[PDB]
């Protein structure tokens, strides 16, 4: 398809045409395909504030103490993207045991990015989901042979 770099720049100029927010059947709000997306397409970036682990631990405790919902994505073993305040619509992507997207860290000189790409062809109005990868709440992704548990 070309350089991950050029795919990324291409995606950044038209990701608003890829997605929309709506009430999810899984939980709360979700993100949905605004059009048909062929497999292995970059859809949207998970944006936020990049912070180290011990900063994230302290930030998370602070948010919970103020009853604001936390939105975070672990990039690597030492860094987290905090989307609680500076995030985009990618923070509403729900988890599914049968995902149609994957979340990947694309290394770049500029800096690391969390890209949500399609794992198969996705059709307009379908909910976007990736596998939150796990280490306990019930999972309500609704898929056949759901793994039943989260976090």
């Amino acid at each position: 398809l070309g350089s991950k770099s050029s795919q990324y720049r291409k995606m950044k100029t038209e990701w608003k045409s890829n997605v929309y927010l709506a009430r999810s059947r899984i939980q709360g709000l979700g993100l949905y395909a605004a059009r048909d997306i062929e497999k292995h397409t970059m859809v949207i970036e998970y944006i936020g504030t990049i912070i180290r682990n011990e900063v994230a631990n302290r930030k998370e405790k602070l948010y919970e103490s103020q009853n604001r919902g936390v939105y975070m994505f672990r990039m690597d073993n030492d860094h987290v993207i905090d989307a609680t305040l500076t995030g985009g619509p990618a923070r509403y992507i729900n988890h599914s045991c049968a995902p149609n997207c994957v979340a990947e860290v694309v290394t770049f000189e500029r800096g690391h990015k969390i890209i949500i790409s399609s794992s198969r062809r996705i059709q307009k109005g379908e909910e976007l989901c990736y596998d939150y990868k796990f280490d306990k709440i019930p999972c309500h992704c609704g898929a056949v042979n759901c793994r039943k548990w989260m976090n």
Binding site: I47, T49, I50, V55, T86, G111
Partner: peptide
């Protein structure tokens, strides 16, 4: 803005009050 921001930690980022 639509991009990542890198947090700049303080010297006292981890200290107790």
């Amino acid at each position: 803005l639509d991009e990542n921001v890198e947090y700049e930690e303080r010297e006292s980022e981890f200290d107790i009050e």
